[PDB]
Amino acid sequence: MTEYKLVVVGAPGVGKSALTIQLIQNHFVDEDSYRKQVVIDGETCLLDILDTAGQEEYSAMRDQYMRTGEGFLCVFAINNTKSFEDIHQYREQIKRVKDSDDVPMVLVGNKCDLAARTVESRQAQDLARSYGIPYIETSAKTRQGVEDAFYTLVREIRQH
Ligand SMILES: [Mg+2]
């Protein structure tokens, strides 16, 4: 069947794993690659998801998995300004290794269940506009937007 190689990236503790585990195992972790057969819009397919480490000391350690990934979830946390500002470094590295200005990618603002938010939705929305990619807010805690984020990414790959 069609396989989709998805890579989840972002700063430490933004919820890369919590999003992946919600999708795959249907539970929130209050404290890796995954393969799952799904059906998305009638298409039977396999999600092969890489849930990346939050720290690397590499950037050549990242080049390996960015090379093979077809689409990327770029995750920040809406209560973490640093994680939002780091999005630019991750996107530029992905473009550098894939030799492309256009790579399937979704900008994800996670932890949208929190009331102490430091990054405004309009802020992230306008950034996503300038990249020409979709912005989706998620909560791994409530499962809001989780399938949305991953399915939208799969649709971006199908359109590339
Ligand atoms: Mg993790």
Curated annotation (Swiss-Prot):
Palmitoylated by the ZDHHC9-GOLGA7 complex. A continuous cycle of de- and re-palmitoylation regulates rapid exchange between plasma membrane and Golgi. S-nitrosylated; critical for redox regulation. Important for stimulating guanine nucleotide exchange. No structural perturbation on nitrosylation. It catalyses: GTP + H2O = GDP + phosphate + H(+). Its EC number is 3.6.5.2. GO terms for molecular function: G protein activity; GDP binding; GTP binding; GTPase activity; phospholipase C activator activity; protein-membrane adaptor activity. The keyword GTP-binding applies. One of its GO terms (cellular component) is GTPase complex. The keyword NADP does not apply. Changing residue 13 to R: In SFM; somatic mutation; shows constitutive activation of the MAPK and PI3K-AKT signaling pathways. Widely expressed. Pfam families: Ras. The modification S-nitrosocysteine is found at residue 112. Keywords: Acetylation, Cell membrane, Cytoplasm, Disease variant, Glycoprotein, Golgi apparatus, GTP-binding, Hydrolase, Isopeptide bond, Lipoprotein, Membrane, Methylation, Nucleotide-binding, Nucleus, Palmitate, Prenylation, Proto-oncogene, S-nitrosylation, Ubl conjugation. It is found in: Cell membrane; Golgi apparatus; Golgi apparatus membrane. GTP binds at residues 13-18, 53-54, 110-113, 139-141. The modification N-acetylmethionine is found at residue 1. The modification N-acetylthreonine is found at residue 2. It is a lipid-anchor. InterPro entries: P-loop_NTPase (IPR027417), Small_GTP-bd (IPR005225), Small_GTPase (IPR001806), Small_GTPase_Ras-type (IPR020849). Alternates between an inactive form bound to GDP and an active form bound to GTP. Activated by a guanine nucleotide-exchange factor (GEF) and inactivated by a GTPase-activating protein (GAP). One of its GO terms (biological process) is Ras protein signal transduction. SMART domains: RAB, RAS, RHO. Involved in the activation of Ras protein signal transduction. Ras proteins bind GDP/GTP and possess intrinsic GTPase activity. It is linked to Costello syndrome: A rare condition characterized by prenatally increased growth, postnatal growth deficiency, intellectual disability, distinctive facial appearance, cardiovascular abnormalities (typically pulmonic stenosis, hypertrophic cardiomyopathy and/or atrial tachycardia), tumor predisposition, skin and musculoskeletal abnormalities. In its GTP-bound form interacts with PLCE1. Interacts with TBC1D10C. Interacts with RGL3. Interacts with HSPD1. Found in a complex with at least BRAF, HRAS, MAP2K1, MAPK3 and RGS14. Interacts (active GTP-bound form) with RGS14 (via RBD 1 domain). Forms a signaling complex with RASGRP1 and DGKZ. Interacts with RASSF5. Interacts with PDE6D. Interacts with IKZF3. Interacts with RACK1. Interacts with PIK3CG; the interaction is required for membrane recruitment and beta-gamma G protein dimer-dependent activation of the PI3K gamma complex PIK3CG:PIK3R6. Interacts with RAPGEF2. Belongs to the small GTPase superfamily. Ras family. This is GTPase HRas. The gene is HRAS.
